[PDB]
Amino acid sequence: SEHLRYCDSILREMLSKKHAAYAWPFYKPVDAEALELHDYHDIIKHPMDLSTVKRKMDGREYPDAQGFAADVRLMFSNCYKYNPPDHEVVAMARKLQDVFEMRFAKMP
Ligand SMILES: CCOC(=O)Nc1cc(-c2ccc(C)c(NS(C)(=O)=O)c2)nn2c(C)nnc12
């Protein structure tokens, strides 16, 4: 669809080298074990990241743009909920969410 195609283009931009400096922590699920975030899955009950969004998009699991945006917004919401406010990953999430919300708002 026209809307889902636009979302795919947003997702491809978020995964592009343009934004790599701050998008890379969202490229794949938080590895709470390697990172030793022993409380991560107690605090975050529905983990989300960009590779999962991409898997669902490629498999055409999102019926509409709102479902796609719900997943992306959960990824960011998880990041703000879990981390200390001054963590570098929070500053990175702020920049990538700016990019995402600005593109999403201009969906034809
Ligand atoms: C108080 C300590 O807080 C944290 O370390 N927080 C977070 C850390 C990282 C993070 C760092 C380094 C690396 C190498 C990775 N890679 S991976 C395979 O997990 O995605 C991720 N992502 N992250 C995301 C999203 N949301 N929070 C965090």
mmCIF file of N, CA and C and ligand atoms in Angstrom:
data_model
loop_
_atom_site.group_PDB
_atom_site.id
_atom_site.type_symbol
_atom_site.label_atom_id
_atom_site.label_comp_id
_atom_site.label_asym_id
_atom_site.label_seq_id
_atom_site.Cartn_x
_atom_site.Cartn_y
_atom_site.Cartn_z
ATOM 1 N N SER A 1 0.823 -1.208 0.000
ATOM 2 C CA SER A 1 0.000 0.000 0.000
ATOM 3 C C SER A 1 0.857 1.258 0.000
ATOM 4 N N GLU A 2 0.223 2.369 -0.359
ATOM 5 C CA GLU A 2 0.909 3.652 -0.378
ATOM 6 C C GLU A 2 1.469 4.007 0.991
ATOM 7 N N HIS A 3 0.685 3.795 2.046
ATOM 8 C CA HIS A 3 1.131 4.128 3.393
ATOM 9 C C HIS A 3 2.230 3.186 3.873
ATOM 10 N N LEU A 4 2.034 1.881 3.704
ATOM 11 C CA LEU A 4 3.042 0.933 4.160
ATOM 12 C C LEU A 4 4.352 1.081 3.391
ATOM 13 N N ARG A 5 4.279 1.422 2.102
ATOM 14 C CA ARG A 5 5.487 1.722 1.338
ATOM 15 C C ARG A 5 6.242 2.904 1.942
ATOM 16 N N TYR A 6 5.528 3.987 2.263
ATOM 17 C CA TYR A 6 6.180 5.125 2.912
ATOM 18 C C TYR A 6 6.859 4.707 4.217
ATOM 19 N N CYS A 7 6.188 3.890 5.034
ATOM 20 C CA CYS A 7 6.810 3.415 6.269
ATOM 21 C C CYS A 7 8.091 2.636 5.985
ATOM 22 N N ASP A 8 8.068 1.761 4.973
ATOM 23 C CA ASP A 8 9.265 1.024 4.581
ATOM 24 C C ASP A 8 10.412 1.964 4.227
ATOM 25 N N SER A 9 10.102 3.071 3.559
ATOM 26 C CA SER A 9 11.128 4.042 3.214
ATOM 27 C C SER A 9 11.671 4.740 4.458
ATOM 28 N N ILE A 10 10.802 5.064 5.414
ATOM 29 C CA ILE A 10 11.280 5.602 6.690
ATOM 30 C C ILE A 10 12.224 4.614 7.362
ATOM 31 N N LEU A 11 11.792 3.352 7.479
ATOM 32 C CA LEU A 11 12.617 2.328 8.117
ATOM 33 C C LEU A 11 13.963 2.173 7.410
ATOM 34 N N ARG A 12 13.951 2.132 6.079
ATOM 35 C CA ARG A 12 15.210 2.049 5.352
ATOM 36 C C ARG A 12 16.099 3.258 5.652
ATOM 37 N N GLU A 13 15.516 4.452 5.765
ATOM 38 C CA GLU A 13 16.338 5.607 6.122
ATOM 39 C C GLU A 13 16.939 5.454 7.519
ATOM 40 N N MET A 14 16.138 5.008 8.490
ATOM 41 C CA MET A 14 16.629 4.845 9.857
ATOM 42 C C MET A 14 17.769 3.836 9.932
ATOM 43 N N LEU A 15 17.812 2.875 9.004
ATOM 44 C CA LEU A 15 18.856 1.858 8.933
ATOM 45 C C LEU A 15 20.029 2.267 8.053
ATOM 46 N N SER A 16 19.983 3.450 7.448
ATOM 47 C CA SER A 16 20.981 3.878 6.483
ATOM 48 C C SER A 16 22.192 4.508 7.170
ATOM 49 N N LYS A 17 23.262 4.659 6.391
ATOM 50 C CA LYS A 17 24.530 5.138 6.929
ATOM 51 C C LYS A 17 24.412 6.581 7.375
ATOM 52 N N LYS A 18 23.484 7.328 6.770
ATOM 53 C CA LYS A 18 23.142 8.687 7.168
ATOM 54 C C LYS A 18 23.022 8.835 8.680
ATOM 55 N N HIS A 19 22.362 7.883 9.336
ATOM 56 C CA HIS A 19 22.043 8.015 10.750
ATOM 57 C C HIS A 19 22.821 7.041 11.623
ATOM 58 N N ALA A 20 23.823 6.357 11.059
ATOM 59 C CA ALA A 20 24.489 5.258 11.756
ATOM 60 C C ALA A 20 25.060 5.681 13.107
ATOM 61 N N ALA A 21 25.568 6.917 13.205
ATOM 62 C CA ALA A 21 26.230 7.370 14.430
ATOM 63 C C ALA A 21 25.339 7.259 15.665
ATOM 64 N N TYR A 22 24.024 7.449 15.522
ATOM 65 C CA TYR A 22 23.117 7.319 16.657
ATOM 66 C C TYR A 22 22.086 6.210 16.499
ATOM 67 N N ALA A 23 21.986 5.580 15.335
ATOM 68 C CA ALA A 23 20.985 4.530 15.175
ATOM 69 C C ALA A 23 21.498 3.144 15.548
ATOM 70 N N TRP A 24 22.816 2.960 15.618
ATOM 71 C CA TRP A 24 23.351 1.611 15.754
ATOM 72 C C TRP A 24 22.883 0.844 16.995
ATOM 73 N N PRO A 25 22.566 1.449 18.148
ATOM 74 C CA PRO A 25 22.101 0.611 19.270
ATOM 75 C C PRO A 25 20.725 0.020 19.044
ATOM 76 N N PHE A 26 19.997 0.484 18.034
ATOM 77 C CA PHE A 26 18.656 0.004 17.726
ATOM 78 C C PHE A 26 18.640 -0.979 16.567
ATOM 79 N N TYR A 27 19.817 -1.311 16.014
ATOM 80 C CA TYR A 27 19.911 -2.212 14.869
ATOM 81 C C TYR A 27 19.474 -3.635 15.195
ATOM 82 N N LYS A 28 19.518 -4.035 16.461
ATOM 83 C CA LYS A 28 19.207 -5.407 16.828
ATOM 84 C C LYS A 28 18.791 -5.431 18.300
ATOM 85 N N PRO A 29 18.174 -6.524 18.766
ATOM 86 C CA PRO A 29 17.622 -6.529 20.132
ATOM 87 C C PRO A 29 18.689 -6.251 21.183
ATOM 88 N N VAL A 30 18.272 -5.592 22.271
ATOM 89 C CA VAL A 30 19.183 -5.364 23.392
ATOM 90 C C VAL A 30 19.659 -6.711 23.911
ATOM 91 N N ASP A 31 20.973 -6.901 23.955
ATOM 92 C CA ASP A 31 21.552 -8.155 24.431
ATOM 93 C C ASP A 31 21.811 -7.996 25.924
ATOM 94 N N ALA A 32 20.747 -8.199 26.709
ATOM 95 C CA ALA A 32 20.811 -7.902 28.139
ATOM 96 C C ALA A 32 21.852 -8.762 28.837
ATOM 97 N N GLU A 33 22.142 -9.936 28.278
ATOM 98 C CA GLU A 33 23.109 -10.844 28.880
ATOM 99 C C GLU A 33 24.533 -10.357 28.649
ATOM 100 N N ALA A 34 24.904 -10.108 27.386
ATOM 101 C CA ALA A 34 26.243 -9.591 27.097
ATOM 102 C C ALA A 34 26.487 -8.264 27.803
ATOM 103 N N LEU A 35 25.461 -7.419 27.878
ATOM 104 C CA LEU A 35 25.579 -6.116 28.516
ATOM 105 C C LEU A 35 25.480 -6.189 30.029
ATOM 106 N N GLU A 36 25.034 -7.323 30.570
ATOM 107 C CA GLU A 36 24.832 -7.495 32.010
ATOM 108 C C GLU A 36 23.800 -6.506 32.547
ATOM 109 N N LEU A 37 22.730 -6.299 31.782
ATOM 110 C CA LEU A 37 21.585 -5.527 32.266
ATOM 111 C C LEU A 37 20.589 -6.488 32.913
ATOM 112 N N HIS A 38 20.962 -6.945 34.115
ATOM 113 C CA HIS A 38 20.250 -8.041 34.768
ATOM 114 C C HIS A 38 18.774 -7.730 34.968
ATOM 115 N N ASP A 39 18.428 -6.450 35.122
ATOM 116 C CA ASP A 39 17.054 -6.006 35.318
ATOM 117 C C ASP A 39 16.327 -5.635 34.026
ATOM 118 N N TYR A 40 16.962 -5.765 32.857
ATOM 119 C CA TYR A 40 16.372 -5.188 31.648
ATOM 120 C C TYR A 40 15.021 -5.816 31.330
ATOM 121 N N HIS A 41 14.959 -7.144 31.299
ATOM 122 C CA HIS A 41 13.714 -7.812 30.961
ATOM 123 C C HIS A 41 12.698 -7.812 32.097
ATOM 124 N N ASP A 42 13.090 -7.450 33.322
ATOM 125 C CA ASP A 42 12.088 -7.195 34.353
ATOM 126 C C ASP A 42 11.405 -5.845 34.151
ATOM 127 N N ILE A 43 12.147 -4.847 33.677
ATOM 128 C CA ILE A 43 11.613 -3.507 33.461
ATOM 129 C C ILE A 43 10.931 -3.386 32.099
ATOM 130 N N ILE A 44 11.501 -4.000 31.065
ATOM 131 C CA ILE A 44 10.996 -3.902 29.699
ATOM 132 C C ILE A 44 10.317 -5.233 29.362
ATOM 133 N N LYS A 45 8.985 -5.245 29.340
ATOM 134 C CA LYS A 45 8.252 -6.485 29.108
ATOM 135 C C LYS A 45 8.023 -6.794 27.631
ATOM 136 N N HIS A 46 8.152 -5.812 26.737
ATOM 137 C CA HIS A 46 8.021 -6.038 25.294
ATOM 138 C C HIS A 46 9.183 -5.369 24.576
ATOM 139 N N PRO A 47 10.319 -6.063 24.459
ATOM 140 C CA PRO A 47 11.479 -5.468 23.794
ATOM 141 C C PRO A 47 11.184 -5.235 22.321
ATOM 142 N N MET A 48 11.756 -4.163 21.770
ATOM 143 C CA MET A 48 11.572 -3.865 20.353
ATOM 144 C C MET A 48 12.838 -3.215 19.823
ATOM 145 N N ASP A 49 13.115 -3.449 18.541
ATOM 146 C CA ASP A 49 14.289 -2.888 17.880
ATOM 147 C C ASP A 49 14.016 -2.856 16.385
ATOM 148 N N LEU A 50 14.959 -2.271 15.634
ATOM 149 C CA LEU A 50 14.717 -2.020 14.211
ATOM 150 C C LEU A 50 14.746 -3.292 13.363
ATOM 151 N N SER A 51 15.557 -4.289 13.732
ATOM 152 C CA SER A 51 15.602 -5.506 12.922
ATOM 153 C C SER A 51 14.279 -6.245 13.006
ATOM 154 N N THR A 52 13.676 -6.252 14.194
ATOM 155 C CA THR A 52 12.350 -6.832 14.371
ATOM 156 C C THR A 52 11.297 -6.073 13.570
ATOM 157 N N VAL A 53 11.320 -4.737 13.628
ATOM 158 C CA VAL A 53 10.426 -3.956 12.775
ATOM 159 C C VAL A 53 10.608 -4.346 11.314
ATOM 160 N N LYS A 54 11.858 -4.517 10.885
ATOM 161 C CA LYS A 54 12.129 -4.873 9.496
ATOM 162 C C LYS A 54 11.621 -6.270 9.163
ATOM 163 N N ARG A 55 11.841 -7.235 10.063
ATOM 164 C CA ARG A 55 11.317 -8.582 9.844
ATOM 165 C C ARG A 55 9.808 -8.535 9.626
ATOM 166 N N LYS A 56 9.096 -7.793 10.482
ATOM 167 C CA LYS A 56 7.644 -7.721 10.353
ATOM 168 C C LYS A 56 7.231 -7.012 9.070
ATOM 169 N N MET A 57 7.917 -5.920 8.718
ATOM 170 C CA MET A 57 7.573 -5.219 7.484
ATOM 171 C C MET A 57 7.794 -6.117 6.272
ATOM 172 N N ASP A 58 8.966 -6.756 6.199
ATOM 173 C CA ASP A 58 9.288 -7.590 5.046
ATOM 174 C C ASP A 58 8.287 -8.726 4.887
ATOM 175 N N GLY A 59 7.855 -9.327 6.004
ATOM 176 C CA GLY A 59 6.798 -10.319 6.035
ATOM 177 C C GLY A 59 5.395 -9.757 5.948
ATOM 178 N N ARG A 60 5.273 -8.440 5.792
ATOM 179 C CA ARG A 60 3.991 -7.759 5.613
ATOM 180 C C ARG A 60 3.046 -8.033 6.783
ATOM 181 N N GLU A 61 3.600 -8.005 8.003
ATOM 182 C CA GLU A 61 2.800 -8.252 9.197
ATOM 183 C C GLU A 61 2.020 -7.023 9.649
ATOM 184 N N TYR A 62 2.505 -5.814 9.371
ATOM 185 C CA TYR A 62 1.768 -4.613 9.764
ATOM 186 C C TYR A 62 0.640 -4.373 8.774
ATOM 187 N N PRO A 63 -0.624 -4.417 9.204
ATOM 188 C CA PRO A 63 -1.717 -4.093 8.284
ATOM 189 C C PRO A 63 -1.778 -2.627 7.909
ATOM 190 N N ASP A 64 -1.191 -1.734 8.702
ATOM 191 C CA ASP A 64 -1.354 -0.308 8.462
ATOM 192 C C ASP A 64 -0.191 0.442 9.100
ATOM 193 N N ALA A 65 -0.098 1.731 8.766
ATOM 194 C CA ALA A 65 1.006 2.545 9.259
ATOM 195 C C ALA A 65 0.971 2.697 10.774
ATOM 196 N N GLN A 66 -0.218 2.709 11.370
ATOM 197 C CA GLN A 66 -0.317 2.863 12.817
ATOM 198 C C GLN A 66 0.337 1.682 13.542
ATOM 199 N N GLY A 67 0.129 0.458 13.061
ATOM 200 C CA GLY A 67 0.807 -0.672 13.681
ATOM 201 C C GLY A 67 2.316 -0.552 13.573
ATOM 202 N N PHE A 68 2.799 -0.113 12.413
ATOM 203 C CA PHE A 68 4.229 0.085 12.243
ATOM 204 C C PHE A 68 4.744 1.134 13.218
ATOM 205 N N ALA A 69 4.030 2.259 13.334
ATOM 206 C CA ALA A 69 4.478 3.326 14.228
ATOM 207 C C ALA A 69 4.400 2.917 15.692
ATOM 208 N N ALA A 70 3.404 2.103 16.065
ATOM 209 C CA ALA A 70 3.332 1.613 17.436
ATOM 210 C C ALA A 70 4.605 0.855 17.815
ATOM 211 N N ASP A 71 5.088 -0.027 16.929
ATOM 212 C CA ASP A 71 6.315 -0.768 17.222
ATOM 213 C C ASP A 71 7.519 0.169 17.340
ATOM 214 N N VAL A 72 7.686 1.092 16.385
ATOM 215 C CA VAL A 72 8.842 1.995 16.441
ATOM 216 C C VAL A 72 8.815 2.813 17.723
ATOM 217 N N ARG A 73 7.631 3.305 18.098
ATOM 218 C CA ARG A 73 7.506 4.153 19.279
ATOM 219 C C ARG A 73 7.739 3.365 20.562
ATOM 220 N N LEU A 74 7.450 2.067 20.541
ATOM 221 C CA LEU A 74 7.740 1.216 21.695
ATOM 222 C C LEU A 74 9.240 1.059 21.884
ATOM 223 N N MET A 75 9.966 0.836 20.787
ATOM 224 C CA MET A 75 11.421 0.799 20.843
ATOM 225 C C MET A 75 11.981 2.010 21.586
ATOM 226 N N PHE A 76 11.540 3.211 21.214
ATOM 227 C CA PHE A 76 12.047 4.408 21.872
ATOM 228 C C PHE A 76 11.562 4.480 23.312
ATOM 229 N N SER A 77 10.270 4.207 23.518
ATOM 230 C CA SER A 77 9.701 4.246 24.858
ATOM 231 C C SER A 77 10.440 3.296 25.798
ATOM 232 N N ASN A 78 10.752 2.082 25.328
ATOM 233 C CA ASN A 78 11.573 1.157 26.119
ATOM 234 C C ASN A 78 12.907 1.788 26.515
ATOM 235 N N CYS A 79 13.547 2.496 25.582
ATOM 236 C CA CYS A 79 14.853 3.088 25.858
ATOM 237 C C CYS A 79 14.754 4.169 26.935
ATOM 238 N N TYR A 80 13.766 5.061 26.822
ATOM 239 C CA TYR A 80 13.608 6.102 27.835
ATOM 240 C C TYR A 80 13.230 5.511 29.187
ATOM 241 N N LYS A 81 12.417 4.459 29.185
ATOM 242 C CA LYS A 81 11.972 3.869 30.443
ATOM 243 C C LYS A 81 13.135 3.221 31.193
ATOM 244 N N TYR A 82 13.981 2.465 30.486
ATOM 245 C CA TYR A 82 14.999 1.674 31.177
ATOM 246 C C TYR A 82 16.206 2.504 31.622
ATOM 247 N N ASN A 83 16.702 3.418 30.761
ATOM 248 C CA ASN A 83 18.025 3.999 31.000
ATOM 249 C C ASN A 83 17.990 5.233 31.899
ATOM 250 N N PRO A 84 19.094 5.509 32.585
ATOM 251 C CA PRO A 84 19.248 6.815 33.228
ATOM 252 C C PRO A 84 19.080 7.917 32.199
ATOM 253 N N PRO A 85 18.469 9.043 32.579
ATOM 254 C CA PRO A 85 18.175 10.088 31.586
ATOM 255 C C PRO A 85 19.408 10.633 30.883
ATOM 256 N N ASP A 86 20.587 10.614 31.520
ATOM 257 C CA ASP A 86 21.779 11.178 30.893
ATOM 258 C C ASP A 86 22.620 10.144 30.141
ATOM 259 N N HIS A 87 22.127 8.921 29.963
ATOM 260 C CA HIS A 87 22.906 7.940 29.223
ATOM 261 C C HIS A 87 23.040 8.372 27.768
ATOM 262 N N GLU A 88 24.188 8.052 27.182
ATOM 263 C CA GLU A 88 24.421 8.404 25.791
ATOM 264 C C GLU A 88 23.381 7.782 24.866
ATOM 265 N N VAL A 89 22.912 6.574 25.184
ATOM 266 C CA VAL A 89 21.948 5.922 24.302
ATOM 267 C C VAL A 89 20.620 6.676 24.308
ATOM 268 N N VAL A 90 20.328 7.400 25.386
ATOM 269 C CA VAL A 90 19.113 8.199 25.421
ATOM 270 C C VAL A 90 19.247 9.385 24.479
ATOM 271 N N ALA A 91 20.413 10.029 24.473
ATOM 272 C CA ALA A 91 20.624 11.131 23.542
ATOM 273 C C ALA A 91 20.529 10.637 22.105
ATOM 274 N N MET A 92 21.056 9.443 21.839
ATOM 275 C CA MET A 92 20.968 8.880 20.498
ATOM 276 C C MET A 92 19.527 8.582 20.116
ATOM 277 N N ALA A 93 18.750 8.006 21.041
ATOM 278 C CA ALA A 93 17.343 7.716 20.774
ATOM 279 C C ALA A 93 16.577 8.994 20.456
ATOM 280 N N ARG A 94 16.890 10.085 21.168
ATOM 281 C CA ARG A 94 16.223 11.357 20.906
ATOM 282 C C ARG A 94 16.433 11.795 19.462
ATOM 283 N N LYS A 95 17.663 11.663 18.955
ATOM 284 C CA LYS A 95 17.943 12.089 17.586
ATOM 285 C C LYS A 95 17.237 11.202 16.573
ATOM 286 N N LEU A 96 17.193 9.897 16.821
ATOM 287 C CA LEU A 96 16.574 9.024 15.830
ATOM 288 C C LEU A 96 15.055 9.128 15.883
ATOM 289 N N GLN A 97 14.486 9.351 17.069
ATOM 290 C CA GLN A 97 13.045 9.550 17.158
ATOM 291 C C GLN A 97 12.625 10.850 16.487
ATOM 292 N N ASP A 98 13.461 11.888 16.584
ATOM 293 C CA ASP A 98 13.204 13.118 15.846
ATOM 294 C C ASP A 98 13.076 12.825 14.366
ATOM 295 N N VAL A 99 14.066 12.111 13.820
ATOM 296 C CA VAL A 99 14.046 11.711 12.418
ATOM 297 C C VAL A 99 12.771 10.939 12.106
ATOM 298 N N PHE A 100 12.449 9.933 12.931
ATOM 299 C CA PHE A 100 11.293 9.093 12.631
ATOM 300 C C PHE A 100 9.999 9.905 12.655
ATOM 301 N N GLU A 101 9.777 10.677 13.726
ATOM 302 C CA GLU A 101 8.517 11.404 13.858
ATOM 303 C C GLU A 101 8.369 12.484 12.797
ATOM 304 N N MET A 102 9.476 13.097 12.372
ATOM 305 C CA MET A 102 9.374 14.110 11.330
ATOM 306 C C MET A 102 8.988 13.490 9.995
ATOM 307 N N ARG A 103 9.604 12.356 9.633
ATOM 308 C CA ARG A 103 9.195 11.654 8.419
ATOM 309 C C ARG A 103 7.752 11.163 8.518
ATOM 310 N N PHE A 104 7.388 10.536 9.642
ATOM 311 C CA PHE A 104 6.047 9.968 9.781
ATOM 312 C C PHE A 104 4.971 11.038 9.645
ATOM 313 N N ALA A 105 5.222 12.229 10.191
ATOM 314 C CA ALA A 105 4.236 13.303 10.141
ATOM 315 C C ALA A 105 3.976 13.796 8.725
ATOM 316 N N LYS A 106 4.899 13.550 7.798
ATOM 317 C CA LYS A 106 4.737 13.996 6.422
ATOM 318 C C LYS A 106 4.292 12.864 5.517
ATOM 319 N N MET A 107 3.700 11.829 6.080
ATOM 320 C CA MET A 107 3.178 10.746 5.276
ATOM 321 C C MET A 107 2.066 11.278 4.389
ATOM 322 N N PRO A 108 2.185 11.169 3.061
ATOM 323 C CA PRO A 108 1.105 11.640 2.193
ATOM 324 C C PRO A 108 -0.185 10.859 2.430
HETATM 325 C C1 LIG B 1 22.864 1.538 32.550
HETATM 326 C C2 LIG B 1 23.358 0.816 31.287
HETATM 327 O O1 LIG B 1 22.468 1.107 30.243
HETATM 328 C C3 LIG B 1 22.771 0.570 28.986
HETATM 329 O O2 LIG B 1 23.810 0.028 28.783
HETATM 330 N N1 LIG B 1 21.737 0.720 27.977
HETATM 331 C C4 LIG B 1 21.781 0.315 26.579
HETATM 332 C C5 LIG B 1 22.908 -0.166 25.935
HETATM 333 C C6 LIG B 1 22.812 -0.499 24.571
HETATM 334 C C7 LIG B 1 23.917 -1.025 23.938
HETATM 335 C C8 LIG B 1 25.207 -0.648 24.288
HETATM 336 C C9 LIG B 1 26.276 -1.254 23.643
HETATM 337 C C10 LIG B 1 26.051 -2.241 22.691
HETATM 338 C C11 LIG B 1 27.232 -2.919 21.991
HETATM 339 C C12 LIG B 1 24.757 -2.626 22.372
HETATM 340 N N2 LIG B 1 24.554 -3.664 21.378
HETATM 341 S S1 LIG B 1 23.156 -4.647 21.328
HETATM 342 C C13 LIG B 1 23.489 -6.165 20.426
HETATM 343 O O3 LIG B 1 22.559 -4.828 22.645
HETATM 344 O O4 LIG B 1 22.045 -3.923 20.676
HETATM 345 C C14 LIG B 1 23.687 -2.018 23.006
HETATM 346 N N3 LIG B 1 21.666 -0.400 23.916
HETATM 347 N N4 LIG B 1 20.528 0.083 24.568
HETATM 348 C C15 LIG B 1 19.258 0.279 24.117
HETATM 349 C C16 LIG B 1 18.750 0.033 22.701
HETATM 350 N N5 LIG B 1 18.528 0.747 25.115
HETATM 351 N N6 LIG B 1 19.345 0.841 26.203
HETATM 352 C C17 LIG B 1 20.580 0.418 25.822
#
